[PDB]
Design an enzyme around this catalytic site. Structure first.
Site, PDB file in Angstrom:
ATOM      1  N   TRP A  84       0.806  -1.217   0.000  1.00 43.69           N
ATOM      2  CA  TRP A  84       0.000   0.000   0.000  1.00 43.69           C
ATOM      3  C   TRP A  84       0.844   1.274   0.000  1.00 43.69           C
ATOM      4  O   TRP A  84       0.435   2.288   0.555  1.00 43.69           O
ATOM      5  CB  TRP A  84      -0.976   0.012   1.173  1.00 43.69           C
ATOM      6  CG  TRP A  84      -1.852  -1.222   1.192  1.00 43.69           C
ATOM      7  CD1 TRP A  84      -1.614  -2.429   1.821  1.00 43.69           C
ATOM      8  CD2 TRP A  84      -3.071  -1.378   0.463  1.00 43.69           C
ATOM      9  NE1 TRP A  84      -2.656  -3.302   1.567  1.00 43.69           N
ATOM     10  CE2 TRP A  84      -3.550  -2.682   0.715  1.00 43.69           C
ATOM     11  CE3 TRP A  84      -3.807  -0.531  -0.371  1.00 43.69           C
ATOM     12  CZ2 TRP A  84      -4.750  -3.154   0.173  1.00 43.69           C
ATOM     13  CZ3 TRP A  84      -5.015  -1.010  -0.922  1.00 43.69           C
ATOM     14  CH2 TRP A  84      -5.466  -2.310  -0.642  1.00 43.69           C
TER      15      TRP A  84
ATOM     16  N   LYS B 158      -6.104  -1.044  -5.084  1.00 41.21           N
ATOM     17  CA  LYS B 158      -6.875   0.188  -5.187  1.00 41.21           C
ATOM     18  C   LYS B 158      -6.103   1.165  -6.055  1.00 41.21           C
ATOM     19  O   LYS B 158      -4.884   1.054  -6.199  1.00 41.21           O
ATOM     20  CB  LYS B 158      -7.096   0.868  -3.835  1.00 41.21           C
ATOM     21  CG  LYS B 158      -7.751   0.012  -2.819  1.00 41.21           C
ATOM     22  CD  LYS B 158      -8.611   0.869  -1.959  1.00 41.21           C
ATOM     23  CE  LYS B 158      -9.992   0.222  -1.855  1.00 41.21           C
ATOM     24  NZ  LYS B 158     -10.943   1.241  -1.372  1.00 41.21           N
TER      25      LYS B 158
ATOM     26  N   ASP C  34     -32.548  -3.883 -17.731  1.00 44.28           N
ATOM     27  CA  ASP C  34     -33.467  -3.486 -16.672  1.00 44.28           C
ATOM     28  C   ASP C  34     -33.589  -1.970 -16.613  1.00 44.28           C
ATOM     29  O   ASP C  34     -32.705  -1.242 -17.058  1.00 44.28           O
ATOM     30  CB  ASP C  34     -33.013  -4.038 -15.314  1.00 44.28           C
ATOM     31  CG  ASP C  34     -32.938  -5.600 -15.288  1.00 44.28           C
ATOM     32  OD1 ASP C  34     -33.820  -6.233 -15.910  1.00 44.28           O
ATOM     33  OD2 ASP C  34     -32.075  -6.196 -14.563  1.00 44.28           O
TER      34      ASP C  34
ATOM     35  N   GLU D 175     -36.939  -4.304 -20.195  1.00 44.25           N
ATOM     36  CA  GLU D 175     -37.885  -4.133 -19.088  1.00 44.25           C
ATOM     37  C   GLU D 175     -38.401  -2.706 -19.150  1.00 44.25           C
ATOM     38  O   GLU D 175     -37.809  -1.779 -18.598  1.00 44.25           O
ATOM     39  CB  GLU D 175     -37.217  -4.443 -17.753  1.00 44.25           C
ATOM     40  CG  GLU D 175     -38.122  -4.478 -16.516  1.00 44.25           C
ATOM     41  CD  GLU D 175     -37.320  -4.279 -15.209  1.00 44.25           C
ATOM     42  OE1 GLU D 175     -37.534  -5.050 -14.249  1.00 44.25           O
ATOM     43  OE2 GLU D 175     -36.454  -3.389 -15.151  1.00 44.25           O
TER      44      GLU D 175
END
Ligand SMILES: OC[C@H]1O[C@H](O[C@H]2[C@H](O)[C@@H](O)[C@@H](O[C@H]3[C@H](O)[C@@H](O)[C@@H](O)O[C@@H]3CO)O[C@@H]2CO)[C@H](O)[C@@H](O)[C@@H]1O
Length: 687
Positions: A96, A133, A358, A400
């Site tokens: 990190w 990250k 959707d 949808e």
């Protein structure tokens, strides 16, 4: 005196439905935006020459995100972040360290990039499945941390990590030693000619246990059940990563990560490969209508700014009025790249065969269904161009769209949205209103036929009598409306059913069959309803004390041949296999000869097959005349009253039905049938 303007680019749609004529100019502008964006995308090349839309999408997912080179053992990572001043890759691989791995190159596009050399011993610099990250330094000097936007795996934190950092997901660098190799071809499928019968499923609930069941378990234990039922396709819900399980998959956090709670990407690949080996297509629920409001493990304020992926909060166009979600800026080129690449990624890397989009009503309208949003519609038009280019003549897209937006499922060249199908989302409520408000003697046959056949010309429809919506804790299924909280004591085959149960079983089959044969061009069944699954579906949440008691599917019920759930299941299998041999779904609408309001009998022909329904609550009919166009000999091919479907076995399925040349019900011929109260039959002509 002006001529009514019908631009050439919507002439196809206007010819299909001349009702569209006064809207032709607004339809033409809608298509024109999409067609200009298509041109823009196809010339987004280093020298500005034309590329295919497929190549655009594929180059995108091959160059964005993190990619390990298996030959040189380098890793390349690129990340779009225009508002960020500096970007750093951090993770377990560098303990990190916020200084050692700056992404120094920020290009004209606002894309940071870094190449990581192999380690001294030749290993990849980032270990397989370790945490990573990206850290951005903003112009004001502050720092934010993000899961990379194109990460392919993101996992729930450990108990200890969540004690220190909260529920935020963690990004994983997925680079296994042996990636899964697909062994099986996609099934033969022609969208224009073939029927598609769709089994709508959710991996996590697919076991009898109160737990999140796995990809591997679905492959081993559920795929054979779906093959037995004869469905052509599986619609996988809740696959795009979502941190909140009870969102049912609709609050997406990591668009390029298949959900890790069910297993690894290789487990899902194996699942889809196995489905393909059994002849079954696999479709993905795609949620491109909105994104979770999560930052850090989602895209909200990804680069520190409020106008990268989403319309800003101050624009008034940036958050959903109900979903607590952010709304995409479809007019941003990089957002178009992100979403279109996402579709090609899922078709190519996981071998999905198509999509259900959707939230289409939320996309289409500036007020999201509580004026049309031209930019969201243009993105959907591009999305259809791409998916149909990826799998020519085979690809399926399904909308949808509760609103029934005209032209949504007409072809793009006609001026339409380019969807193949829309969901028939009004149909479940018709059955609920009848069961809840009308006595059985008072069913209106014409209103049933009108609702089932009220479909826009040229716009194919997936019909269903209930869906994942209705199975949820808000409502009751058809089984609950018909049989309430019936238990194994009520469902034993070793005693005569009560009137309630006898009526429930018969109508459960009849409602499915008339939806399946009269209501649309395709069919959908939600997991468990094919056997009248009891109770209801619910996910763990605060309101139920994080219970998984209803977050499961009691498939064990179907294996008990001393219970009646299996009767419902066997009839479903018979219905789907009947249609596979005697096509009626992807065919012109039925020719209805009878909707008799006193006898409660409906009769129609579709694609040459004959369908007869006796919905009368008490009256049986013998030698009932049914009009038939093509003279000949007919035989029953599907019979709801059969003993192994839970009926009383009154109807002789061996009988030959000869037509008589005498006009009846505006048909040249008739047959005579025996149809007990609450039974239905399908007949085909013998050759
Ligand atoms: O640094 C090692 C440690 O953290 C790892 O990543 C975190 C950053 O190092 C850390 O600066 C963190 O920032 C958090 C704040 O410190 C804290 O106030 C918290 O409430 O908000 C921030 C969370 O983003 O950001 C990242 C988080 O991934 C890594 O997560 C750990 O496993 C590691 O032990």
């Amino acid at each position: 005196m002006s001529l009514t303007k019908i631009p050439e680019n919507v002439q196809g749609a206007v010819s299909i439905d001349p009702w569209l004529e006064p809207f032709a100019d607004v339809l033409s502008e809608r298509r024109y935006l999409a067609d200009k964006w298509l041109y823009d995308i196809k010339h987004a090349t280093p020298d500005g020459s034309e590329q295919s839309l497929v190549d655009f999408a594929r180059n995108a997912y091959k160059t964005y995100g993190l990619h390990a080179n298996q030959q040189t053992k380098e890793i390349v990572y690129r990340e779009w972040a225009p508002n960020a001043q500096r970007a750093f890759l951090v993770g377990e691989f560098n303990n990190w360290n916020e200084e050692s791995h700056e992404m120094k190159h920020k290009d004209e596009f606002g894309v940071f990039s870094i190449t990581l050399a192999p380690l001294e011993n030749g290993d990849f610099a980032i270990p397989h499945d370790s945490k990573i990250k990206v850290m951005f330094v903003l112009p004001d000097g502050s720092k934010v941390y993000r899961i990379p936007a194109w990460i392919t795996r993101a996992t729930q934190p450990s108990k200890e990590t969540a004690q220190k950092y909260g529920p935020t997901y963690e990004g994983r660098f997925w680079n296994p030693p042996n990636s899964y190799q697909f062994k099986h071809q996609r099934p033969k499928f022609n969208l224009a000619n073939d029927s598609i019968k769709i089994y709508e499923a959710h991996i996590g609930i697919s076991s009898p246990e109160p737990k999140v069941a796995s990809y591997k378990e679905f492959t081993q234990n559920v795929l054979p059940r779906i093959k037995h039922l004869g469905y052509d396709a599986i619609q996988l819900m809740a696959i795009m990563e979502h941190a909140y399980y009870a969102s049912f998959g609709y609050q997406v956090t990591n668009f390029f990560a298949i959900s890790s709670r069910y297993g690894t990407p290789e487990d899902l690949k194996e699942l889809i490969d196995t489905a393909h080996s059994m002849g079954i297509l696999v479709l993905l629920d795609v949620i491109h209508s909105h994104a979770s409001k999560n930052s850090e493990d989602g895209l909200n304020m990804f680069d520190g700014s409020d106008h990268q992926y989403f319309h800003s909060l101050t624009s008034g166009r940036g958050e959903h009025p109900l979903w607590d979600s952010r709304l995409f800026n479809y007019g941003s080129f990089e957002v178009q790249r992100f979403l279109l690449a996402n579709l090609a990624y899922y078709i190519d890397v996981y071998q999905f065969d198509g999509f259900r989009f959707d939230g289409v009503t939320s996309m289409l309208y500036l007020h999201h269904g509580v004026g049309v949003d031209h930019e969201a519609l243009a993105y959907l038009m591009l999305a259809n161009d791409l998916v149909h280019d990826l799998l020519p003549e085979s690809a399926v897209t399904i909308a949808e769209d509760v609103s029934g937006y005209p032209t949504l499922c007409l072809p793009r060249t006609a001026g339409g949205g380019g969807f193949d199908y829309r969901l028939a989302m009004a149909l479940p409520d018709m059955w609920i209103k009848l069961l809840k408000t009308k006595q059985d003697d008072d069913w209106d046959m014409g209103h049933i036929v009108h609702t089932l056949t009220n479909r826009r010309h040229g716009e194919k429809v997936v019909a269903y009598c209930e869906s994942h919506d209705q199975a949820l804790v808000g409502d009751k299924t058809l089984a609950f409306w018909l049989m309430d909280a019936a238990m194994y004591t009520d469902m034993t085959v070793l005693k005569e059913p009560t009137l309630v149960i006898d009526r429930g079983i018969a109508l459960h089959k009849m409602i499915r069959l008339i939806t399946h044969s009269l209501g649309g061009e395709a069919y959908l069944n939600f997991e468990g309803n094919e056997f009248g699954h009891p109770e209801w579906l619910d996910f763990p949440r605060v309101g139920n004390n994080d219970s998984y008691h209803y977050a499961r599917r009691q498939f064990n019920l179907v294996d008990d041949d001393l219970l009646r759930y299996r009767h419902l299941n066997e009839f479903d299998a018979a219905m789907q296999n009947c249609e596979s041999k005697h096509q009626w779904l992807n065919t012109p609408q039925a020719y209805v000869s009878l909707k008799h309001e006193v006898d409660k009998v409906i009769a129609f022909e579709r694609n040459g097959h004959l369908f007869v329904f006796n919905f009368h609550p008490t009256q049986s009919f013998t030698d009932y005349r049914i009009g038939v166009d093509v003279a000949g000999t007919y035989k029953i091919v599907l019979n709801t009253d059969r003993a192994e479907f839970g009926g009383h076995n009154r109807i002789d399925e061996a009988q030959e039905f000869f037509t008589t040349d005498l006009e009846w019900n505006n048909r040249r011929n008739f047959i005579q049938v025996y149809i007990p109260s609450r039974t239905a039959i399908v007949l085909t002509r013998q050759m």
